[PDB]
Amino acid sequence: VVANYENASMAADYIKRVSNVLPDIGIICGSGLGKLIEEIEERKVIPYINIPNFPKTTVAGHVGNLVLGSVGGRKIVAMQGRLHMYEGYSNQEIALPIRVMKLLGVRVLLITNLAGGINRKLKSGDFVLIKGHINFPGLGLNNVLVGPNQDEFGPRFPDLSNAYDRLLQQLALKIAQENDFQDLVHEGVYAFNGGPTYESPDESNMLLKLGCDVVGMSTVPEVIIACHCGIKVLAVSLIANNSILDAENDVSINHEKVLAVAEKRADLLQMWFKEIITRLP
Amino acid sequence: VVANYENASMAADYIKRVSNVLPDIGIICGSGLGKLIEEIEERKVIPYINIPNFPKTTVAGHVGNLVLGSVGGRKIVAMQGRLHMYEGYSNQEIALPIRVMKLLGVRVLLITNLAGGINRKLKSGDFVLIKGHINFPGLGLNNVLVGPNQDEFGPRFPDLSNAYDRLLQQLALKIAQENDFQDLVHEGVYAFNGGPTYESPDESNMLLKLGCDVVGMSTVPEVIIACHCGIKVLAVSLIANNSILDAENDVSINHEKVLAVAEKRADLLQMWFKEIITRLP
Amino acid sequence: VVANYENASMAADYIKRVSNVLPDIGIICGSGLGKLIEEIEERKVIPYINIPNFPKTTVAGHVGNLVLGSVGGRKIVAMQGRLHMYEGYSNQEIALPIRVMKLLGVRVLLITNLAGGINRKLKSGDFVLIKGHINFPGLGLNNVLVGPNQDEFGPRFPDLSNAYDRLLQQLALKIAQENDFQDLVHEGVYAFNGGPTYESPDESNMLLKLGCDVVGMSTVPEVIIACHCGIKVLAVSLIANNSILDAENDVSINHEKVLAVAEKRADLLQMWFKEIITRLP
Numbered sequence: 001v002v003a004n005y006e007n008a009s010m011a012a013d014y015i016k017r018v019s020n021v022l023p024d025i026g027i028i029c030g031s032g033l034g035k036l037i038e039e040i041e042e043r044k045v046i047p048y049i050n051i052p053n054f055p056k057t058t059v060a061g062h063v064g065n066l067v068l069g070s071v072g073g074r075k076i077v078a079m080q081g082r083l084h085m086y087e088g089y090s091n092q093e094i095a096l097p098i099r100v101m102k103l104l105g106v107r108v109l110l111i112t113n114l115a116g117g118i119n120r121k122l123k124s125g126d127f128v129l130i131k132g133h134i135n136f137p138g139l140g141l142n143n144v145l146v147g148p149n150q151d152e153f154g155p156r157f158p159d160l161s162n163a164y165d166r167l168l169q170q171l172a173l174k175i176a177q178e179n180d181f182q183d184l185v186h187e188g189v190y191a192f193n194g195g196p197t198y199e200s201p202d203e204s205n206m207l208l209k210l211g212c213d214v215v216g217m218s219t220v221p222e223v224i225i226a227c228h229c230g231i232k233v234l235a236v237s238l239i240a241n242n243s244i245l246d247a248e249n250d251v252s253i254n255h256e257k258v259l260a261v262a263e264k265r266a267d268l269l270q271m272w273f274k275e276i277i278t279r280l281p
Numbered sequence: 282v283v284a285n286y287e288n289a290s291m292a293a294d295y296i297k298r299v300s301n302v303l304p305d306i307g308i309i310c311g312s313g314l315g316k317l318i319e320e321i322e323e324r325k326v327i328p329y330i331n332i333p334n335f336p337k338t339t340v341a342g343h344v345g346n347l348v349l350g351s352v353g354g355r356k357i358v359a360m361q362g363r364l365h366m367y368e369g370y371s372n373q374e375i376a377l378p379i380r381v382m383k384l385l386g387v388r389v390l391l392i393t394n395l396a397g398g399i400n401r402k403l404k405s406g407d408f409v410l411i412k413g414h415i416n417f418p419g420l421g422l423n424n425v426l427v428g429p430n431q432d433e434f435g436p437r438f439p440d441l442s443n444a445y446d447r448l449l450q451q452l453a454l455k456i457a458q459e460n461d462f463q464d465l466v467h468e469g470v471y472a473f474n475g476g477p478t479y480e481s482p483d484e485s486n487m488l489l490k491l492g493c494d495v496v497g498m499s500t501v502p503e504v505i506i507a508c509h510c511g512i513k514v515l516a517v518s519l520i521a522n523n524s525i526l527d528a529e530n531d532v533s534i535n536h537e538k539v540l541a542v543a544e545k546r547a548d549l550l551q552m553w554f555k556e557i558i559t560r561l562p
Numbered sequence: 563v564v565a566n567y568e569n570a571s572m573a574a575d576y577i578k579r580v581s582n583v584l585p586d587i588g589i590i591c592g593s594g595l596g597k598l599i600e601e602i603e604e605r606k607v608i609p610y611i612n613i614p615n616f617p618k619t620t621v622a623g624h625v626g627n628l629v630l631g632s633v634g635g636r637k638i639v640a641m642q643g644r645l646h647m648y649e650g651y652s653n654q655e656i657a658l659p660i661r662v663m664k665l666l667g668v669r670v671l672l673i674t675n676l677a678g679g680i681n682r683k684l685k686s687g688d689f690v691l692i693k694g695h696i697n698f699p700g701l702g703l704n705n706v707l708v709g710p711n712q713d714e715f716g717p718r719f720p721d722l723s724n725a726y727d728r729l730l731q732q733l734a735l736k737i738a739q740e741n742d743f744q745d746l747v748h749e750g751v752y753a754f755n756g757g758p759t760y761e762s763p764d765e766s767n768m769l770l771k772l773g774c775d776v777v778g779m780s781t782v783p784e785v786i787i788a789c790h791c792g793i794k795v796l797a798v799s800l801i802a803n804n805s806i807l808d809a810e811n812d813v814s815i816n817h818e819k820v821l822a823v824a825e826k827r828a829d830l831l832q833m834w835f836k837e838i839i840t841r842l843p
């Protein structure tokens with residue numbers, strides 16, 4: 001299934017027929033950070049398996065829903081269950097849900113994820129507003145846009161220099177200042193490690209030398225498909241460890257330590273993003 | 282279709298039957314830079330679609346011709362319409378036209394492309410004689426030679442240390458000195474970004490740290506297949522922007538700015554390469 | 563053929579029925595360095611082609627055997643003929659033999675390979691105990707674990723920080739000290755170049771900047787599959803050139819120079835690894 005104009009139009013025809021919502025705003029929430037999606041009012045929940053041309057996700061399993069409703073009086077659509085390229089999904093499978101968002105009317109996409117810290121001043125539980133990226137898969141001929149260009153959505157050769165909207169980063173920081181947690185909020189460069197192994201101690205050392213502030217296994221593919229078709233993006237990483245410090249001290253990372261950090265910050269992130277949605281121009 | 286001895290011999294049998302030219306020299310021209318190929322004398326134009334075992338290019342579209350004729354009294358063969366790996370072509374598809382060149386008798390291959398500048402002293406419209414490369418796809422298990430080795434063409438483990446012939450670089454510089462444009466001519470290290478997104482601002486910063494002079498999305502695959510089977514190579518990048526400066530000043534690159542630079546330099550490059558062909562040993 | 567619990571159990575059922583050995587220790591020997599495998603006592607030699615679900619290797623050709631027997635009174639299993647990812651084998655093909663080792667009872671895996679030297683103090687014929695790695699394919703979405711996780715073998719997101727067991731590195735160094743060749747033994751960080759082209763002069767310069775001590779085209783995939791399923795690992799590189807020096811002096815590497823270094827050190831490595839096996843806790 002190619003992520004082309006006709007296959008995405010077929011999916012959007014089904015969603016509109018079921019939901020009766022035309023959303024302006026899309027959200028993709030990171031693992032353990034999706035509590036906001038249960039707070040959506042006047043909801044329709046749509047399993048991916050019921051939507052024409054949506055990718056099959058029965059191998060990886062776990063939740064896979066599109067949720068449409070209202071937050072702060074705004075009309076939104078959420079992916080509940082994010083598709084990760086380390087699972088083996090092709091370029092076409094990742095791109096189609098984003099391109100369906102576009103046809104549904106999404107103009108702004110808000111994204112959260114979990115990441116490892118590389119910059120020395122970053123601590124467990126800090127947040128990082130992403131302002132640029134280093135796309136190791138893209139340099140290495142695994143860019144999410146490798147393949148024929150779908151000209152109806154965007155250009156063959158996109159410019160990523162404003163892929164992370166500066167006015168959205170400012171709005172996010174203003175909201176944290178209003179609530180006296182700006183001291184947790186940083187800006188930084190995100191490195192895309194295809195994964196699924198955690199960054200090794202010597203990979204982490206390397207990324208420091210190359211000026212990365214955080215590293216993770218998601219987000220860059222969705223950002224590129226969104227930028228290709230003219231959707232503005234805000235992306236926020238929650239730091240779950242300092243990998244540079246682990247490397248210098250011979251300490252281990254693991255999934256259980258990571259998920260506990262998400263639990264610790266989930267409710268603050270929920271409230272932050274609720275107010276961001278309410279206050280988007 | 283594997284790029285093996287028999288499939289390439291089948292294609293070469295067809296070309297020789299149609300053209301009545303045995304070329305010594307191959308040329309692959311970059312986008313907007315192929316005007317020289319219309320100046321070829323006593324031509325035969327052969328669409329790729331008519332050549333047995335040549336890769337299908339009807340998805341990407343646009344021109345796809347092999348052109349055989351005479352320049353400066355020398356017998357040449359040109360690819361009019363270059364195959365790019367960001368389109369989704371496999372290793373076998375890229376390699377076969379080069380290996381057919383070899384069976385047709387090509388001993389020297391001359392290549393031009395468009396690239397972004399990373400070295401601070403490089404400006405829009407400068408030329409760069411490539412003297413080595415950093416092959417991010419190759420480090421990342423997308424080398425154009427991944428797969429079984431075709432032993433008839435070359436070794437399992439090639440040495441790339443003289444892939445860019447030093448005497449051809451000297452000849453090119455001598456010709457520019459004769460015409461008083463040597464001040465436009467540099468030498469440099471080319472980084473292969475698989476693409477198709479332009480290098481991001483923070484990717485550009487990274488490449489500076491790693492000692493790259495230019496970056497682009499082509500040329501390294503063809504160079505490796507040519508070196509594998511013993512064809513000498515000259516490769517010249519036309520600089521269409523300084524990406525380090527764009528990053529420091531928060532400026533955008535785009536395809537329309539890039540194509541205008543090609544237009545500005547096309548005729549000088551045409552004349553340069555005409556005299557290079559005439560004067561190859 | 564997926565490298566899942568049932569397909570690997572089917573292979574292990576066949577091996578046990580033929581060999582009557584339950585090994586504790588696995589070995590994977592590098593090119594020209596497998597002489598120890600002929601010294602295995604009370605052997606069974608099993609061609610890969612006869613084992614259910616083992617990957618087909620008739621395209622690459624050359625030896626492909628599993629050998630089970632006794633060394634120093636210990637029960638072992640060896641791969642005679644290593645699978646390399648530059649040949650075009652998928653993730654599943656590489657992983658299955660290691661996962662069969664696990665089901666057969668392997669608790670420790672010992673690995674040797676040939677590599678290029680990047681650290682300036684390393685010379686032709688030196689050995690390097692690997693203590694960490696930089697996995698360019700993994701950063702670039704070609705990690706050997708990309709695809710669905712096989713939960714029976716290990717976790718979705720493994721930690722690689724103790725993938726190279728520290729007590730095994732110490733035991734190896736102690737043995738070299740006992741035999742007065744500790745002056746040949748170093749420790750270092752290994753860069754995985756997917757290959758099959760040798761590291762270029764400017765790739766080598768880059769790797770120095772990023773803190774790599776050696777570079778090669780194997781070993782990291784097997785280490786990751788082993789670590790995933792809880793097998794301890796010792797990995798030793800034999801240095802066959804200094805690629806930083808070749809780059810500064812404009813000198814060439816080649817396969818014939820490399821194989822002669824293996825010949826020069828094969829017998830010392832054979833005896834070293836024999837005593838390591840004998841003395842594993």
Ligand SMILES: Oc1ncc(F)cn1
Pocket residue numbers: 114115116117198199215216217239240241253258
């Ligand atoms: O803490 C952490 N989370 C996700 C990562 F990919 C790496 N490190």
Ligand SMILES: Oc1ncc(F)cn1
Pocket residue numbers: 395396397398479480496497498520521522534539
């Ligand atoms: O100016 C420019 N041309 C091609 C590139 F790949 C990047 N930058």
Ligand SMILES: Oc1ncc(F)cn1
Pocket residue numbers: 676677678679760761777778779801802803815820
């Ligand atoms: O000497 C050497 N051996 C293997 C390599 F991959 C590179 N260099």
